[PDB]
Design an enzyme around this catalytic site. Structure first.
Site, PDB file in Angstrom:
ATOM      1  N   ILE A   1       3.705  14.113  -8.131  1.00  0.00           N
ATOM      2  CA  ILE A   1       2.822  14.003  -9.277  1.00  0.00           C
ATOM      3  C   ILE A   1       2.396  15.341  -9.865  1.00  0.00           C
ATOM      4  CG2 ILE A   1       0.728  12.838 -10.100  1.00  0.00           C
ATOM      5  CD1 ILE A   1       1.082  10.723  -7.930  1.00  0.00           C
TER       6      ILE A   1
ATOM      7  N   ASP B   1      -2.682  27.087   2.102  1.00  0.00           N
ATOM      8  CA  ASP B   1      -3.264  25.793   2.465  1.00  0.00           C
ATOM      9  C   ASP B   1      -4.689  25.591   1.986  1.00  0.00           C
ATOM     10  OD1 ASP B   1      -4.366  23.730   4.365  1.00  0.00           O
ATOM     11  OD2 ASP B   1      -2.316  24.062   5.161  1.00  0.00           O
TER      12      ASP B   1
ATOM     13  N   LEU C   1      -1.973  14.620   2.514  1.00  0.00           N
ATOM     14  CA  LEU C   1      -0.938  13.837   3.182  1.00  0.00           C
ATOM     15  C   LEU C   1      -1.138  12.427   2.684  1.00  0.00           C
ATOM     16  CD1 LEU C   1      -0.897  15.293   6.803  1.00  0.00           C
ATOM     17  CD2 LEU C   1       0.477  16.111   4.780  1.00  0.00           C
TER      18      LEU C   1
ATOM     19  N   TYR D   1      -5.454   6.903   6.016  1.00  0.00           N
ATOM     20  CA  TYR D   1      -5.176   7.465   4.701  1.00  0.00           C
ATOM     21  C   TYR D   1      -6.174   6.943   3.653  1.00  0.00           C
ATOM     22  CZ  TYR D   1      -3.180   8.134  -0.005  1.00  0.00           C
ATOM     23  OH  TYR D   1      -2.994   8.438  -1.322  1.00  0.00           O
TER      24      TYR D   1
ATOM     25  N   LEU E   1       8.380   1.505  -2.613  1.00  0.00           N
ATOM     26  CA  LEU E   1       9.412   0.648  -3.144  1.00  0.00           C
ATOM     27  C   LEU E   1      10.517   1.299  -4.002  1.00  0.00           C
ATOM     28  CD1 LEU E   1      10.399  -2.216  -3.369  1.00  0.00           C
ATOM     29  CD2 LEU E   1       8.860  -2.531  -5.405  1.00  0.00           C
TER      30      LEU E   1
HETATM   31  N1  LIG Z   1       2.508   8.827  -4.828  1.00  0.00           N
HETATM   32  C1  LIG Z   1       1.608   7.795  -4.793  1.00  0.00           C
HETATM   33  O1  LIG Z   1       1.997   6.638  -4.828  1.00  0.00           O
HETATM   34  C2  LIG Z   1       0.126   7.957  -4.687  1.00  0.00           C
HETATM   35  C3  LIG Z   1      -0.830   6.871  -5.016  1.00  0.00           C
HETATM   36  C4  LIG Z   1      -2.265   7.333  -5.030  1.00  0.00           C
HETATM   37  C5  LIG Z   1      -2.616   8.566  -4.660  1.00  0.00           C
HETATM   38  N2  LIG Z   1      -1.706   9.608  -4.453  1.00  0.00           N
HETATM   39  C6  LIG Z   1      -2.203  10.935  -4.186  1.00  0.00           C
HETATM   40  O2  LIG Z   1      -1.807  11.787  -5.191  1.00  0.00           O
HETATM   41  C7  LIG Z   1      -1.595  13.103  -4.635  1.00  0.00           C
HETATM   42  C8  LIG Z   1      -0.212  13.580  -4.946  1.00  0.00           C
HETATM   43  O3  LIG Z   1       0.713  12.599  -4.440  1.00  0.00           O
HETATM   44  P1  LIG Z   1       2.277  12.888  -4.539  1.00  0.00           P
HETATM   45  O4  LIG Z   1       2.986  11.617  -4.658  1.00  0.00           O
HETATM   46  O5  LIG Z   1       2.576  13.916  -5.583  1.00  0.00           O
HETATM   47  O6  LIG Z   1       2.691  13.490  -3.117  1.00  0.00           O
HETATM   48  P2  LIG Z   1       3.397  14.784  -2.703  1.00  0.00           P
HETATM   49  O7  LIG Z   1       3.672  14.822  -1.267  1.00  0.00           O
HETATM   50  O8  LIG Z   1       4.665  14.895  -3.471  1.00  0.00           O
HETATM   51  O9  LIG Z   1       2.516  15.950  -3.221  1.00  0.00           O
HETATM   52  C9  LIG Z   1       1.497  16.498  -2.339  1.00  0.00           C
HETATM   53  C10 LIG Z   1       1.725  17.991  -2.250  1.00  0.00           C
HETATM   54  O10 LIG Z   1       0.631  18.579  -1.471  1.00  0.00           O
HETATM   55  C11 LIG Z   1       1.152  19.581  -0.632  1.00  0.00           C
HETATM   56  N3  LIG Z   1       0.240  19.690   0.532  1.00  0.00           N
HETATM   57  C12 LIG Z   1      -0.004  18.734   1.499  1.00  0.00           C
HETATM   58  N4  LIG Z   1      -0.992  19.096   2.307  1.00  0.00           N
HETATM   59  C13 LIG Z   1      -1.359  20.364   1.854  1.00  0.00           C
HETATM   60  C14 LIG Z   1      -2.337  21.259   2.277  1.00  0.00           C
HETATM   61  N5  LIG Z   1      -3.112  21.104   3.292  1.00  0.00           N
HETATM   62  N6  LIG Z   1      -2.432  22.460   1.659  1.00  0.00           N
HETATM   63  C15 LIG Z   1      -1.599  22.706   0.617  1.00  0.00           C
HETATM   64  N7  LIG Z   1      -0.657  21.958   0.123  1.00  0.00           N
HETATM   65  C16 LIG Z   1      -0.596  20.772   0.798  1.00  0.00           C
HETATM   66  C17 LIG Z   1       2.558  19.071  -0.270  1.00  0.00           C
HETATM   67  O11 LIG Z   1       3.398  20.206   0.122  1.00  0.00           O
HETATM   68  C18 LIG Z   1       3.048  18.434  -1.617  1.00  0.00           C
HETATM   69  O12 LIG Z   1       3.767  19.401  -2.442  1.00  0.00           O
HETATM   70  C19 LIG Z   1      -1.930  13.008  -3.134  1.00  0.00           C
HETATM   71  O13 LIG Z   1      -3.270  13.411  -2.923  1.00  0.00           O
HETATM   72  C20 LIG Z   1      -1.706  11.529  -2.880  1.00  0.00           C
HETATM   73  O14 LIG Z   1      -2.430  11.033  -1.730  1.00  0.00           O
HETATM   74  C21 LIG Z   1      -0.375   9.324  -4.582  1.00  0.00           C
HETATM   75  O1  LIG Z   2      10.531  -1.029   1.278  1.00  0.00           O
HETATM   76  C1  LIG Z   2       9.614  -1.492   0.617  1.00  0.00           C
HETATM   77  C2  LIG Z   2       8.488  -0.824   0.032  1.00  0.00           C
HETATM   78  C3  LIG Z   2       7.566  -1.532  -0.595  1.00  0.00           C
HETATM   79  N1  LIG Z   2       7.676  -2.947  -0.707  1.00  0.00           N
HETATM   80  C4  LIG Z   2       6.635  -3.698  -1.449  1.00  0.00           C
HETATM   81  O2  LIG Z   2       6.492  -3.198  -2.754  1.00  0.00           O
HETATM   82  C5  LIG Z   2       5.078  -3.131  -3.173  1.00  0.00           C
HETATM   83  C6  LIG Z   2       4.727  -1.689  -3.329  1.00  0.00           C
HETATM   84  O3  LIG Z   2       4.781  -1.061  -2.009  1.00  0.00           O
HETATM   85  P1  LIG Z   2       4.432   0.477  -1.956  1.00  0.00           P
HETATM   86  O4  LIG Z   2       4.519   0.940  -0.563  1.00  0.00           O
HETATM   87  O5  LIG Z   2       5.312   1.317  -2.797  1.00  0.00           O
HETATM   88  O6  LIG Z   2       2.952   0.799  -2.578  1.00  0.00           O
HETATM   89  P2  LIG Z   2       1.552   0.148  -2.366  1.00  0.00           P
HETATM   90  O7  LIG Z   2       1.355  -0.987  -3.333  1.00  0.00           O
HETATM   91  O8  LIG Z   2       1.511  -0.370  -0.982  1.00  0.00           O
HETATM   92  O9  LIG Z   2       0.488   1.382  -2.665  1.00  0.00           O
HETATM   93  C7  LIG Z   2       4.333  -3.843  -2.129  1.00  0.00           C
HETATM   94  O10 LIG Z   2       4.212  -5.210  -2.538  1.00  0.00           O
HETATM   95  C8  LIG Z   2       5.234  -3.574  -0.882  1.00  0.00           C
HETATM   96  O11 LIG Z   2       5.142  -4.679   0.025  1.00  0.00           O
HETATM   97  C9  LIG Z   2       8.722  -3.652  -0.178  1.00  0.00           C
HETATM   98  O12 LIG Z   2       8.833  -4.865  -0.201  1.00  0.00           O
HETATM   99  N2  LIG Z   2       9.647  -2.880   0.449  1.00  0.00           N
END
Ligand SMILES: NC(=O)c1ccc[n+]([C@@H]2O[C@H](COP(=O)([O-])OP(=O)(O)OC[C@H]3O[C@@H](n4cnc5c(N)ncnc54)[C@H](O)[C@@H]3O)[C@@H](O)[C@H]2O)c1
Ligand SMILES: O=c1ccn([C@@H]2O[C@H](COP(=O)(O)OP(=O)(O)O)[C@@H](O)[C@H]2O)c(=O)[nH]1
Ligand SMILES: NC(=O)c1ccc[n+]([C@@H]2O[C@H](COP(=O)([O-])OP(=O)(O)OC[C@H]3O[C@@H](n4cnc5c(N)ncnc54)[C@H](O)[C@@H]3O)[C@@H](O)[C@H]2O)c1
Ligand SMILES: O=c1ccn([C@@H]2O[C@H](COP(=O)(O)OP(=O)(O)O)[C@@H](O)[C@H]2O)c(=O)[nH]1
Ligand code: NA
Ligand code: NA
Ligand code: NA
Ligand code: NA
Ligand code: NA
Ligand code: NA
Ligand code: NA
Ligand code: NA
Lengths: 338, 338
Positions: free
Chosen positions: A12, A58, A83, A149, A200
């Site tokens: 992101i 970090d 994480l 988490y 997914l």
């Molecule tokens: N991808 C999703 O579906 C999802 C949904 C909701 C929330 N989020 C949140 O959004 C944020 C970004 O998610 P993402 O998908 O880009 O994941 P990501 O793993 O690609 O990005 C996280 C980044 O943070 C860095 N990082 C981790 N711990 C660190 C630390 N202690 N110090 C410095 N750098 C560190 C990692 O190297 C990575 O580049 C996260 O906080 C995640 O929990 C993501």
């Molecule tokens: O291998 C996978 C990964 C995800 N899902 C389903 O797809 C939706 C999205 O899952 P995901 O882990 O991506 O995100 P979440 O909604 O849990 O934040 C949910 O209904 C999961 O059960 C699935 O069937 N198989």
């Protein structure tokens, strides 16, 4: 503006940095590289059209954060670092609490020290907990997340809220993300998970690329239209754009600004599978498997607030999410170069 | 046993250390002295009848914690260290989250590193949140604490619970304290708050000693028998004893053992005032003031579980709480020597 984007080289954050630079902001990326590679840096700059400064380090290192903040005269911080593997968090709770809870605490403590008071936090729908009321609305009280988490996210939101109360000049946005998918339209930037993808979309992509056999669909007996899980998928570019707008419109606006970032509609696993098969030109293999532990049947965002207050709403479709994902996956089968 | 008692030179910890030594355990005290003085050390040893080892240091220093743990072959850790001024936590949230949340996280992380897996955590009734159901029972789901302090306690309990799930061999006791009061019967060890005491008992004592004018009774219109707030006061020696028993009986018993530590009965502010006047030989001055922000009218503990499971129950009375407090206050008007 001068913005420090923690986790900026991740999924992101990378896309957000591109949009930020395109809006001509001065971007400082802070990342420890535990889940991303320096190889994306050049892509960011090339797509953003401007050079972002990168610092390897970090969020837990408060002294360094403080130094960065001051050194770059940062005006606002966009906190993506942390994480996020759910299952893993169950297995290794401490690392999640440390990187997310302590990680953020060290970062905002550094901000206090450097007099920085504009923050954007990457939160999530998990904060809603077991909420039978859908779509999810910012006005709903939060619940109890089921994993370390999810808990770590809600704890940060609470800490941030108390901080704001104590330091009322702060502007803090709690951006609750739904289900981020997609990739930059160029096909040269996208999600690059290591090992088995937990989400997914990336899993589907890997099945489509020929890396995996079949997509295991977790559960087919849910009380949904097709029996599979329903979610609110939101394209990463739309998420990125929402971040630029939130940053530009909320800076120096005191308060705790909570916004759900989602499309506002639900799609099932099958709907996603189907869009992907369409995008890649071949039927995606899949099978039904038992329900995944802790999963909710269906949920999506009520995104009216962000529409109203920030004039932000998604513009990319589910098909685009799928096509953009396949384009990146197919153009870069090995992800970012080592 | 070999036990590391963090916060060991503070109010509750000091009395606990005495009882531990009296039971012949080997005691290592770890304290940063932010709210206690080295002057209590000799008292501890004298009343405990054995020498406890003392280390000046901070729970946030994981490397040091790890070293202490290994160096002293600790078998179990009793975690009392932290910040606990409610009002102050509202004003300075970060310091609370750091010392309590991060503080504990660094400590248990150090334990993991040193292979220590028996823990006792100082929790509180605040975890119950706004619970209309009284008395409070361990089986009740937790609520939402109203202050950064209360929140920090509940967050630690959650982190500890997840840790235990992840490392099932751990024995973790969540000791929810009610309203600790009293002092060692000798009158030479007791609570020594600096500045304005936030709790009822010490405030009353200071009015009685001639330091303060009048006790402000926060609210006189509550739905209670006398209109003043009702609580479950528990003598510090009883709390201390509960800690020795919990430690001895739960060590190496895997699980998260939650126990409310209270007398199981309620007493009003007036009841406390009256007992104190009785103890000190003169009417304690007091006046009615407005209700204190966030206060609940009445609550007390359901202490059946600890009775049943650990065979522990209070044995000191409200009068003793008051008399012991006055004895210490009067014998040592300046607290612990500088
Ligand atoms: N991808 C999703 O579906 C999802 C949904 C909701 C929330 N989020 C949140 O959004 C944020 C970004 O998610 P993402 O998908 O880009 O994941 P990501 O793993 O690609 O990005 C996280 C980044 O943070 C860095 N990082 C981790 N711990 C660190 C630390 N202690 N110090 C410095 N750098 C560190 C990692 O190297 C990575 O580049 C996260 O906080 C995640 O929990 C993501
Ligand atoms: O291998 C996978 C990964 C995800 N899902 C389903 O797809 C939706 C999205 O899952 P995901 O882990 O991506 O995100 P979440 O909604 O849990 O934040 C949910 O209904 C999961 O059960 C699935 O069937 N198989
Ligand atoms: N006293 C009460 O009414 C009450 C009620 C419930 C819970 N508690 C909890 O019980 C515990 C003990 O309470 P208490 O009344 O004895 O208070 P206290 O202040 O007397 O004892 C706490 C001790 O911890 C030490 N300390 C603080 N932060 C530290 C850190 N980071 N590193 C090392 N040492 C540190 C202080 O110097 C002090 O000696 C605390 O965790 C408190 O929140 C107390
Ligand atoms: O100066 C004081 C301190 C406390 N109290 C009341 O005494 C009870 C105990 O307050 P305390 O702060 O000691 O502990 P709490 O119950 O809040 O953990 C509550 O009903 C408080 O309102 C009071 O009236 N005056
Ligand atoms: Na500034
Ligand atoms: Na304040
Ligand atoms: Na991975
Ligand atoms: Na790769
Ligand atoms: Na051991
Ligand atoms: Na496990
Ligand atoms: Na004080
Ligand atoms: Na003194």
């Amino acid at each position: 503006m001068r913005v420090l984007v923690t986790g900026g080289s991740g999924y992101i954050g990378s896309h957000t940095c591109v949009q930020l630079l395109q809006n001509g902001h001065d971007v400082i990326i802070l990342d420890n590289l535990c889940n991303s590679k320096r190889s994306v840096l050049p892509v960011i700059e090339r797509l953003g059209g401007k050079h972002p400064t990168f610092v390897e380090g970090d969020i837990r290192n408060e002294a360094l954060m403080t130094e960065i903040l001051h050194d770059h005269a940062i005006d606002t911080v966009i906190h993506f670092a942390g994480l996020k593997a759910v299952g893993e968090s169950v297995q290794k709770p401490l690392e999640y609490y440390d990187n997310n809870v302590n990680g953020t605490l060290r970062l905002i403590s550094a901000m206090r020290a450097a007099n920085v008071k504009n923050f954007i936090f990457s939160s999530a729908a998990t904060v809603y907990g077991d909420q039978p009321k859908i779509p999810y609305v910012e006005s709903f009280p939060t619940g109890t997340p089921q994993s370390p988490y999810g808990k770590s996210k809600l704890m940060v939101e609470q800490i941030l809220t108390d901080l704001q109360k104590a330091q009322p000049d702060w502007s803090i946005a709690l951006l609750r993300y739904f289900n981020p998918v997609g990739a930059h339209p160029s096909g040269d930037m996208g999600e690059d998970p290591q090992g088995i993808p937990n989400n997914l979309m990336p899993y589907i992509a890997q099945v489509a690329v020929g890396r995996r056999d079949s997509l295991a669909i977790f559960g087919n007996d849910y009380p949904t239209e097709d029996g599979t899980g329903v979610r609110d998928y939101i394209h990463v570019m739309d998420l990125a754009d929402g971040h630029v707008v939130a940053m530009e419109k909320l800076a120096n606006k005191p308060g705790v600004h909570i916004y759900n970032l989602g499309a506002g509609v639900g799609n099932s696993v099958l709907d996603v599978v189907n869009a992907f098969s369409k995008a890649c030109g071949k039927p995606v293999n899949y099978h039904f498997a038992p329900r995944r532990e802790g999963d909710l049947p269906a949920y999506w965002a009520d995104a009216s607030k962000a529409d109203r207050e920030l004039n932000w709403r998604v513009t990319r479709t589910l098909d685009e999410m799928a096509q953009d994902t396949w384009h990146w996956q197919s153009r870069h089968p090995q992800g970012y170069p080592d």
